[PDB]
Amino acid sequence: GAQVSTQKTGIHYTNINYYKDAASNSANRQDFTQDPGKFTEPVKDIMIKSLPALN
Amino acid sequence: GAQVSTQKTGIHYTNINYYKDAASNSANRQDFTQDPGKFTEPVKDIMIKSLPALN
Amino acid sequence: GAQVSTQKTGIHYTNINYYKDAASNSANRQDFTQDPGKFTEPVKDIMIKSLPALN
Amino acid sequence: GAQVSTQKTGIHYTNINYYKDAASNSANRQDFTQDPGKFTEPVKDIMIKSLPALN
Amino acid sequence: GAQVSTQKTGIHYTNINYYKDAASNSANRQDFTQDPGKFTEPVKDIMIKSLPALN
Amino acid sequence: AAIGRVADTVGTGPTNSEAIPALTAAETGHTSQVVPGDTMQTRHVKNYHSRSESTIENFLCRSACVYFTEYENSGAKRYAEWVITPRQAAQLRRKLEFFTYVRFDLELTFVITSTQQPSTTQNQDAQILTHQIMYVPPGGPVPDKVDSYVWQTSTNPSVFWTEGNAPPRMSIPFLSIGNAYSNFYDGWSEFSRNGVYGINTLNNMGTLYARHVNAGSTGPIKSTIRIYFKPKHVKAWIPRPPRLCQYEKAKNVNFQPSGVTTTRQSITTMTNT
Amino acid sequence: GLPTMNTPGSCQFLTSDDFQSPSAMPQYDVTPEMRIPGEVKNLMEIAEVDSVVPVQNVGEKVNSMEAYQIPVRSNEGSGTQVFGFPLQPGYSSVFSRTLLGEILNYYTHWSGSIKLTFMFCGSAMATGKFLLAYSPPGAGAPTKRVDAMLGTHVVWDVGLQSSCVLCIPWISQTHYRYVASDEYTAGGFITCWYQTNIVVPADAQSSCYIMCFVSACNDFSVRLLKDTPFITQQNFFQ
Amino acid sequence: GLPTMNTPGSCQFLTSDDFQSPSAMPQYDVTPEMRIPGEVKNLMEIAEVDSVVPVQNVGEKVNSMEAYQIPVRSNEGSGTQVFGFPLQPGYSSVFSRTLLGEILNYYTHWSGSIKLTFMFCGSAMATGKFLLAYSPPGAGAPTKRVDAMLGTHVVWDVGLQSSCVLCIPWISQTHYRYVASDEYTAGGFITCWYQTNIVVPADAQSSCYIMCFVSACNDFSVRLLKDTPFITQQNFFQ
Amino acid sequence: GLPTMNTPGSCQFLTSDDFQSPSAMPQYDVTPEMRIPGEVKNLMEIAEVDSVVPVQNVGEKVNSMEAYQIPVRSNEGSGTQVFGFPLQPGYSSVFSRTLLGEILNYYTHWSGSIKLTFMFCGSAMATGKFLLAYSPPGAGAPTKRVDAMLGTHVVWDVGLQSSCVLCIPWISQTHYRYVASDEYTAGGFITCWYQTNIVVPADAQSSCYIMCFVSACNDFSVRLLKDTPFITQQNFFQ
Ligand SMILES: CCCCCCCCCCCCCCCC(=O)O
Ligand SMILES: *C(=O)CCCCCCCCCCCCC
């Protein structure tokens, strides 16, 4: 049982893990998740862009 | 998931991409498209061979 | 006919034996069986933890 | 897509072409066609063995 | 088209012949046929163990 | 026909109409579309000829040595360096310059060879050589000596090779900052129309650095590194006249005026003289 | 024995290769993961966070908090430039060591709009309006206010809302720009001017400071991973 | 460890090989493509475009526009040859540096019909008829008009339609011909003659010029990729 | 990186190996095939075609058409041997250079019946009967007609049908015989005799000739491909 993912472009590729340890697998170079909020905007009260930050 | 194309002749071959980047794939040696018009014949008014080019 | 097991983690891997002798196969590193009883607790009369060992 | 032929004997084998040019394929060692007629017997009028060649 | 046999033990293995000649195949190490009769007991008249060989 | 087949010859017979395939007017800028049958009786010919070997891809897809330098075991030049460019070699450069703009991925191949230098060192016993090629994109720290910290390559990409093994090789994406590599640039680098002029104002492909990792022997050794380019996944636009005058400089199109062609006796001589 | 044939590249060691390799610790049981605040997935998450820009590199100030201070004070005129630096998030000493700049310096190409947030640290009683402007390359850096206002700009009026933003729109002829310096990849000039001079009352300091924060926008990206020039050594540390 | 067995060719480096190879820039985001006018897919697209042929190689003229001029003038007779060159699109100095010829010189074999378009650049008042002819090999180049008309030809009459085409049909014993020179692969002779001499009125120049354009037909193809003799060097350019 | 393990034979170069290998001419368009008369699929197609045997090796005759002539003439008796050679299609000088023999000499083993066709080239008026015989090994070659007729034979009577065939049946203890010489693989003796002497009339030549053709039957085959002894050299030809 192989897997089949998408390559990087502007097609797919096949992968078969050969080792009993996950540590042996290739890198996870395609995790494109993003969550800036944790850093930019860690305010308790939501700040609405178009509004004044203070009133 | 491999692919299967036709070889050059006057039969097929199997291909499996092994890398995560399309840049790593083999050449695209079988694109036989052709469009001479862009170069030979870039006239705005269609010129009909059997006709006179000027009248 | 290959086989497909689970790798070690906190995914699977494919295996195909290539030799006619089982001796040639890779190690059996995933047998997690356990039976302490043979050693700790080889008493003929079951001893119930919460109870007194003698009366 | 591989192919599967018969080996020479008195069983089969698997083949997968890996190149884009038919020129790269292995030899065609199993074409057992035969047509002696072109050479032995290129007569315009069929000669029947048991008959006299001239009369 | 591969084949799948049993290994020697007290599991299977996969095999794919890669050559056009049967001569190229691996040995036939698992033919366990046996027929001692040809040698021990090549008598024309069946001899029944429990009986006397002559009477 | 067959995707890449060529046109078949249409059988024709005697004519006598007012159809004038043969008469046209080049002034239009249009190339005539005449075919044999238009000006002579032809037979029918099923043509199976393919134009497969003329595709932009097949034409530019062959490894080409674009440059090579050397670095030595010891001495003054212990490491090599080369500002990346396809214009120092004439072969490949003339092909690429067949088109104004081009886009492609690149297959890099390196041929690394060593040669023992003449010296007076007694009992030389070389160990196997291991080289290191390293790429430094514009803006990155450069090595000043064969043992500079820069060869750490925590981020710079670099290959480690050992003599005897197959040539090291690797693929490179289309690295342009624009939508296509430019082969020509009739412009300047400054808005005042000063500074640099020509193709070289766009070339900022960084530098390549080679070196040994071990000295190997007590004796002196010189190593040559040949860089080969092989365009893959090619797309080309606006074809132009092929280079006529020999190349003069690597960073511009400067040439020494040349005749249009070789000569011959008279406009009647069927010989190349 | 399956007929095989090695190809170029075989046995090499590419620093950026990506293959599978046997574990030296067969069946090692990793420590279970744990929820740790603030995980990071992409460096751009960081490049979107404001960091204080050192607009005042001038001389010795680089060795004090003053590097981060922008001098503003009441004048006997308006039109006076307040500062001016180029749009070279990667090269210019003004940005190069910023949160954004540090990241850019590990790459070769950059693209996207940039935000320059300006906080007025004068006193509640201090007032005034400034003209934050961005002039794309092509001509020179504007030398007079009347020439800077001809470009992309924001007239900031100081008031209860302390900070104000000058969004530097990504205008460029190419999709990406070089992180390193290059005139082809020229980015233009960012300048500030007095729109209507600072005006404090009596007993209120007439000389003030303005801080400048920088961060990337949601259309910012970076390409071609490389090593930073900003870190070096001569020998393995002991 | 899957039993394998390397075969001849292993580890070599063929210049024209075609294999996959690891990217040195893992996950690099290529610049998005863009619609650029005039894309090229096959070199034959170019070889189908007319280019001006330098029929007049004669001496020093190769260093002036004159190389592209074909002398025609009023005579006191007809039958006079006007020019004559062989059918060696690849070798003959007449074609070798043409758009068609340049391309042919990167290949070893060629096949197909060829178009020679002739534009009369005389004056509106100038007239005349010429005999464009193509004689397949086997005999010699025709030396008289009466011997050239025995072959494939087109009697061109100059008039409002400035240009006229002589389609050189691909006649040959083999499917392909060598781009280089070889008598087996002989291609024949292309010659022009006066059918009915030039005839201008008074006050109109009696000496004129005829240009010659060349291009490939839709049945033209090229094989066996090779290097051009036309480009050389002694050292890497600096 | 798929765990692999090279086996013996790896990297070698067997002359008779059979593997795939990259084309040096990627996408080269082969010349379309064409119907050419007389295609050949197997060498046996050739070995089934008669070729004239040189029964008369005797001395200097090998350097003239005489080598292919079998002397026959009117005698004052019958029983006279006319010729006699062994069944060594590969070794015997009689066959070795034949069409059949040439082919056999590229192999090590052979098997099958063989046809010896005899054409009488005397004159229309000449007559006679001959005894074509084949004696399997084991005893010696027959020395008298009365001893040859004890074996496989054909009494040929000359007449309107010029030729006559002696089919040499494949009798042998093994399936195949060696092309080279070996007594285990002995093939027997082929001899001819006068059954009833030649009898011409007056004015008609009494001395004649008989030609001998040889070819393989439909049960003929050859094994173990080898090099011919019949071709040699000392240096590459110039
Ligand atoms: C070890 C990593 C090596 C990486 C090799 C990178 C080479 C870059 C090649 C750029 C290609 C041809 C471009 C011409 C540039 C221009 O003039 O615009
Ligand atoms: C995607 O197609 C997966 C399906 C088949 C994958 C197998 C690739 C080839 C496996 C046979 C073993 C090859 C030894 C090279």
PDB file of N, CA and C in Angstrom, chain B residues 23-50:
ATOM      1  N   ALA B  23       9.624  19.964 -10.676  1.00  0.00           N
ATOM      2  CA  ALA B  23      10.895  20.321 -11.297  1.00  0.00           C
ATOM      3  C   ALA B  23      11.755  19.081 -11.489  1.00  0.00           C
ATOM      4  N   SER B  24      11.571  18.100 -10.612  1.00  0.00           N
ATOM      5  CA  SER B  24      12.338  16.867 -10.674  1.00  0.00           C
ATOM      6  C   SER B  24      11.902  15.908 -11.782  1.00  0.00           C
ATOM      7  N   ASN B  25      10.738  16.136 -12.378  1.00  0.00           N
ATOM      8  CA  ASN B  25      10.279  15.219 -13.420  1.00  0.00           C
ATOM      9  C   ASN B  25      11.112  15.260 -14.688  1.00  0.00           C
ATOM     10  N   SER B  26      11.046  14.173 -15.453  1.00  0.00           N
ATOM     11  CA  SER B  26      11.776  14.079 -16.703  1.00  0.00           C
ATOM     12  C   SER B  26      11.206  15.088 -17.692  1.00  0.00           C
ATOM     13  N   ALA B  27      11.915  15.287 -18.793  1.00  0.00           N
ATOM     14  CA  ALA B  27      11.500  16.249 -19.799  1.00  0.00           C
ATOM     15  C   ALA B  27      10.177  15.916 -20.480  1.00  0.00           C
ATOM     16  N   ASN B  28       9.591  16.932 -21.093  1.00  0.00           N
ATOM     17  CA  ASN B  28       8.342  16.781 -21.794  1.00  0.00           C
ATOM     18  C   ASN B  28       8.735  16.724 -23.244  1.00  0.00           C
ATOM     19  N   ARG B  29       9.260  15.573 -23.646  1.00  0.00           N
ATOM     20  CA  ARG B  29       9.724  15.398 -25.011  1.00  0.00           C
ATOM     21  C   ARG B  29       8.656  15.033 -26.027  1.00  0.00           C
ATOM     22  N   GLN B  30       7.405  14.897 -25.605  1.00  0.00           N
ATOM     23  CA  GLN B  30       6.387  14.506 -26.575  1.00  0.00           C
ATOM     24  C   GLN B  30       5.269  15.496 -26.913  1.00  0.00           C
ATOM     25  N   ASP B  31       5.511  16.783 -26.668  1.00  0.00           N
ATOM     26  CA  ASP B  31       4.529  17.819 -26.974  1.00  0.00           C
ATOM     27  C   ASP B  31       4.641  18.202 -28.446  1.00  0.00           C
ATOM     28  N   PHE B  32       3.837  17.569 -29.287  1.00  0.00           N
ATOM     29  CA  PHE B  32       3.908  17.828 -30.710  1.00  0.00           C
ATOM     30  C   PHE B  32       3.002  18.915 -31.261  1.00  0.00           C
ATOM     31  N   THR B  33       2.560  19.815 -30.397  1.00  0.00           N
ATOM     32  CA  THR B  33       1.707  20.910 -30.839  1.00  0.00           C
ATOM     33  C   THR B  33       2.427  21.712 -31.917  1.00  0.00           C
ATOM     34  N   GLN B  34       1.659  22.434 -32.720  1.00  0.00           N
ATOM     35  CA  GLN B  34       2.213  23.257 -33.781  1.00  0.00           C
ATOM     36  C   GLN B  34       1.236  24.344 -34.152  1.00  0.00           C
ATOM     37  N   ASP B  35       1.744  25.560 -34.285  1.00  0.00           N
ATOM     38  CA  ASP B  35       0.922  26.694 -34.669  1.00  0.00           C
ATOM     39  C   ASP B  35       1.762  27.719 -35.427  1.00  0.00           C
ATOM     40  N   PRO B  36       2.053  27.440 -36.698  1.00  0.00           N
ATOM     41  CA  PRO B  36       2.853  28.352 -37.513  1.00  0.00           C
ATOM     42  C   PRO B  36       2.221  29.734 -37.714  1.00  0.00           C
ATOM     43  N   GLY B  37       0.894  29.784 -37.747  1.00  0.00           N
ATOM     44  CA  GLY B  37       0.192  31.041 -37.957  1.00  0.00           C
ATOM     45  C   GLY B  37       0.729  32.286 -37.266  1.00  0.00           C
ATOM     46  N   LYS B  38       1.063  32.168 -35.982  1.00  0.00           N
ATOM     47  CA  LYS B  38       1.597  33.295 -35.210  1.00  0.00           C
ATOM     48  C   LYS B  38       2.734  34.005 -35.960  1.00  0.00           C
ATOM     49  N   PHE B  39       3.545  33.208 -36.652  1.00  0.00           N
ATOM     50  CA  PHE B  39       4.697  33.704 -37.387  1.00  0.00           C
ATOM     51  C   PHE B  39       4.427  33.818 -38.887  1.00  0.00           C
ATOM     52  N   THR B  40       4.177  32.704 -39.547  1.00  0.00           N
ATOM     53  CA  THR B  40       3.863  32.778 -40.960  1.00  0.00           C
ATOM     54  C   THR B  40       2.372  33.087 -41.023  1.00  0.00           C
ATOM     55  N   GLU B  41       2.005  34.260 -41.536  1.00  0.00           N
ATOM     56  CA  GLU B  41       0.591  34.679 -41.645  1.00  0.00           C
ATOM     57  C   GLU B  41      -0.032  35.529 -40.534  1.00  0.00           C
ATOM     58  N   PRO B  42       0.726  36.445 -39.911  1.00  0.00           N
ATOM     59  CA  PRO B  42       0.110  37.254 -38.856  1.00  0.00           C
ATOM     60  C   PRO B  42      -0.603  38.476 -39.426  1.00  0.00           C
ATOM     61  N   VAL B  43      -1.333  38.260 -40.510  1.00  0.00           N
ATOM     62  CA  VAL B  43      -2.083  39.322 -41.160  1.00  0.00           C
ATOM     63  C   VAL B  43      -3.472  39.451 -40.531  1.00  0.00           C
ATOM     64  N   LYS B  44      -3.984  40.674 -40.455  1.00  0.00           N
ATOM     65  CA  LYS B  44      -5.298  40.939 -39.871  1.00  0.00           C
ATOM     66  C   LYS B  44      -6.437  40.469 -40.771  1.00  0.00           C
ATOM     67  N   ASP B  45      -6.236  40.535 -42.078  1.00  0.00           N
ATOM     68  CA  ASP B  45      -7.263  40.103 -43.014  1.00  0.00           C
ATOM     69  C   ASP B  45      -6.791  38.817 -43.656  1.00  0.00           C
ATOM     70  N   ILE B  46      -7.570  37.768 -43.471  1.00  0.00           N
ATOM     71  CA  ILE B  46      -7.228  36.458 -43.988  1.00  0.00           C
ATOM     72  C   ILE B  46      -6.912  36.452 -45.475  1.00  0.00           C
ATOM     73  N   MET B  47      -5.752  35.912 -45.814  1.00  0.00           N
ATOM     74  CA  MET B  47      -5.346  35.857 -47.204  1.00  0.00           C
ATOM     75  C   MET B  47      -5.580  34.474 -47.788  1.00  0.00           C
ATOM     76  N   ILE B  48      -6.504  34.383 -48.736  1.00  0.00           N
ATOM     77  CA  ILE B  48      -6.819  33.113 -49.373  1.00  0.00           C
ATOM     78  C   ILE B  48      -5.843  32.745 -50.489  1.00  0.00           C
ATOM     79  N   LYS B  49      -5.020  31.738 -50.219  1.00  0.00           N
ATOM     80  CA  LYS B  49      -4.011  31.267 -51.156  1.00  0.00           C
ATOM     81  C   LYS B  49      -4.300  31.463 -52.649  1.00  0.00           C
ATOM     82  N   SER B  50      -5.384  30.872 -53.143  1.00  0.00           N
ATOM     83  CA  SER B  50      -5.739  30.957 -54.566  1.00  0.00           C
ATOM     84  C   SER B  50      -6.069  32.354 -55.085  1.00  0.00           C
TER      85      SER B  50
END
